[PDB]
Amino acid sequence: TVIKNETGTISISQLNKNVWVHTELGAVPSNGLVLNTSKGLVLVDSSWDDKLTKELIEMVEKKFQKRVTDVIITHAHADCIGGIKTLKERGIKAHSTALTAELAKKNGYEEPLGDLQTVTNLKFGNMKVETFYPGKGHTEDNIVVWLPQYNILVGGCLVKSTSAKDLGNVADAYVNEWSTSIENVLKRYRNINAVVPGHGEVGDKGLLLHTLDLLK
Template identity: 45%
Template sequence: MRYLFPFLSFLLFTTSAQAQSAQRPGLSVTPLNKQVYVHTTYGMYGGTAVPANGLIIRTKDGIVLVDTGWDTDNNTDNTRELLQWISQNLHQPVRLCIVTHGHEDRVGGISELRKAGVRVVSTPLTAQKSVKLGFESPEGILSNDTTFSIGNEPIRCYFPGQGHTADNIVVWLPNQKILYGGCLVKSVAAFGMGNLADANLNEWGNSIQNLMTQFKSARIVVPGHDEWTDTRSLAHTLQLLKKHAESKK
């Protein structure tokens, strides 16, 4: 990750006895710069522990989260640990959480955030899907292209089109030139398309092309799972989609 500042080469890593087991690692937090961190929690998928990424954004008026920890309706340990880490290390309140689509690796910790008094927002469609999955509903107030500022930090929530799900949005930080692609974007470390249960494979490629046009100045692109490098992850997603289509012929 050549865009990281030299003094950020270390990894901030924390675990708790409650969250960590032999099967599922605990929380890790990795700084991208002085203001933005990637939080990574783990869930079980196909019998394997899989990492899920989200963002922690520091502003002058508090913390903004992008996506909760990967939790279930009866176990919110990951999001609880995330809130504890922020309190102990950043010493700021969490003001808001933006959830990027209605799957448990994005919305699973809503109840824990609500207990802590954190406002959780999404698009109306994500709010509907969250309820269908058995989770509390975020406030479905985001339009398909919403920009707002918290603590002088502009944050853009953008729907580029269907792909991983019908409701997947991305988050753009223009001051940081960081694009959080969520599960619409596949890591360069990915060899397959992952969970396609709610995918629109016919539109996914068009949505990625839209991102490449809209956010061509991105220095870092953070996918929903696995490692992040630079904008090669967008091109890699297109390659994976092409391979998947060819395998179905």
């Protein structure tokens, strides 16, 4: 099941029962997750800006007839924290590491909570979510998200898609450490099923290996 807005700039694809992938075009696509829980909707990453973020939120709240209660910000770039102003005015908790919170302020964005530690486990209803900071890579602050009940890993921009031959913006990246950080993710999660890249189609652990290949 895939749902889109009339313009086609926002789509939501179902991965499983309560897990969907949201994609917005900035055209340049960016992925995130929508988790449908018994106590509201939880998103992994917002969108490019406040307009798209508001649209995304309105779209999912209308579909599931629930409130978006929390959002996990994976790093301080527009495709992830672009709609932070929209989140705060709607009472949506914007979770992030302390580092992401300070880099956000530095990039002219309002500040997220800065509550996430290196390993943080959250439970929304019956939905379990684990956030993990593997080290510097695409950015100094990038984190990954793990759904242990499904063995689904949200790689974010730390992971490139199968067709990608470019690492993207590396002005804020730590290219040399990036490989070590991906290795930390591989060592931590031994049995991965699906892997969601920052941009592109959902794949498997092969995407992490592919990214390591690009980094060589």
